[PDB]
Amino acid sequence: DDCNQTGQMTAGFLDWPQGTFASQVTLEGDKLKVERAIDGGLETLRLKLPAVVTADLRLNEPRYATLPNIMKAKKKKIEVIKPGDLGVDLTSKLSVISVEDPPTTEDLVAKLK
């Protein structure tokens, strides 16, 4: 869906601070130092620590599901539940109308802009 909303939105409902698009993370006790990727470069933040952080590309290189551990993970547990339980609705005043397909230098810097 290319959204970029859930992290932010979760952080709002808990009223916790959000550290969006993180390139780096540290605990400084009951505070998180969060580097984040903004348009010009990297801004740094500090957050009181119930917190919400959304991983950006830069943050890390994810690891491989190691064959041994794929097996070991078949043991570990997974509680399976409903949204109805947690006390959440679901009904949605959004609706998709459609999903189509994509289709001098004075003109050109104009047609990039």
Binding site: Y64, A65, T66, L67, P68, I70, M71, K74
Partner: protein, 387 residues
């Protein structure tokens, strides 16, 4: 009970890892290693770190104790990146298999254990300069002398031949030529740093060039008696039992390559225009791609069938030799056509298909040639009908 062509979720996650490593780490350097013919160490160590090697080794030796089916789905993925590197790490199951199927409890925790601890290679040495297909014309002699044996002779075309910690070794036990093959040969576990052993220079072949292959000369090589596999004369059964569990994996290798050939030819056919149209709009090219797709899909199932039969406890000689003969064959057919569709570019050394043609030819020769596969299938077939 019931036919199923769907993987376990465990196998899916295996395939996904195998495939992440194949596309991400093998492919981007596979031409580089084919060009230099250098043994691909960093990748073998990575694959070992990921748990993708020595997959048959049982749990009580610190192994994963996984099926023939799992090896096959894994190794199709590695092959798709490169059959040179897939063959390298396949050499281990080959050398290991006899010990897994024929070794005692100390033999097993000794030679299998170490594979669990570091990434060491092993190889299977049977072929000699005078015999490959006719395994029963092996003439490397092995004499009992007290508490041990004296191995004398020369082995050819051995994968990991210069890279192995240890060898499965098959050698002629009995001088009597009236001796039945089935009881004429002994099979050993033979550490590679034994005195007498002379590994040769790297063999330069047309294909799978980064894989290590070489001749070995054994002179007066002392093998401790408690590394004999089952007994004297026992080797021939042992060596032959191995294939059940390894032939499917070689076939699965071939489809890997065929699949690669198919994707490379299908991408190009969607870019290149001739006479104002994409190549896919040329019925002859579609016909070609269809047939490649047919051959791959059946090749795939065939190795899937052989892997399932042995995993079910049954023996699979018929099905496995079907899979190798067909896979071998269609890997080659698919390599050339991929070259052909790419055209002039396909014949060039910076496009990725030319390597596949060169890599592919091996699959009609090692691990049993296209001819001796058909004798095996014919023999199993005929036997179903006689009293």
């Amino acid at each position: 009970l019931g036919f199923s062509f769907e993987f376990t979720e465990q196998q899916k996650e295996f395939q996904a890892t195998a495939r992440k490593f194949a596309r991400e780490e093998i492919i981007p350097v596979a031409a580089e290693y084919d060009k230099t013919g250098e043994y691909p160490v960093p990748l073998i160590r990575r694959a070992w770190e990921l748990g993708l090697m020595n997959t048959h080794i049982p749990e009580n030796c610190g192994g994963l104790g996984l099926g023939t089916f799992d090896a096959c789905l894994i190794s199709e993925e590695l092959a798709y990146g490169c059959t040179g590197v897939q063959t390298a790490i396949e050499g281990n199951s080959l050398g290991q298999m006899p010990i897994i199927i024929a070794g005692n409890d100390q033999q097993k925790k000794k030679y299998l254990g170490r594979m669990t601890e570091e990434p060491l290679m092993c190889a299977y040495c049977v072929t000699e300069p005078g015999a490959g297909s006719d395994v029963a014309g092996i003439k490397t002699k092995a004499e009992k002398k007290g508490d041990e044996y004296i191995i004398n002779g020369q082995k050819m075309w051995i994968t990991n031949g210069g890279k192995a910690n240890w060898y499965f070794l098959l050698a002629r036990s009995d001088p009597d030529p009236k001796a039945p093959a089935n009881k004429a040969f002994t099979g050993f576990i033979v550490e590679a740093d034994t005195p007498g052993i002379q590994i040769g220079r790297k063999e330069l072949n047309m294909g799978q060039r980064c894989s290590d292959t070489r001749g070995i000369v054994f002179e007066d090589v002392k093998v401790p008696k408690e590394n004999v596999l089952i007994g004297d004369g026992a080797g021939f059964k042992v060596a032959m039992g191995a294939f059940d569990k390894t032939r499917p994996v070689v076939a699965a290798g071939a489809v890997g390559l065929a699949q690669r050939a198919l994707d490379e030819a299908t991408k190009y056919a969607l870019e290149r225009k001739t006479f104002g149209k994409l190549l896919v709009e040329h019925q002859a090219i579609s016909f070609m791609l269809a047939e490649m797709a047919m051959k791959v899909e059946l090749a795939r199932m065939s190795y899937q069938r052989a892997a399932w039969e042995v995993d079910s406890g049954r023996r699979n000689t018929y099905y496995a030799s079907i899979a190798k003969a067909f896979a071998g064959d269609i890997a080659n057919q698919l390599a050339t056509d991929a070259v052909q569709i790419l055209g002039g570019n396909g014949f060039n050394t910076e496009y990725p298909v030319e390597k596949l043609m060169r890599d592919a030819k091996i699959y009609q020769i090692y691990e049993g040639t296209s001819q001796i596969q058909r004798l095996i299938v014919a023999r199993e077939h005929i036997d179903k009908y006689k009293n």
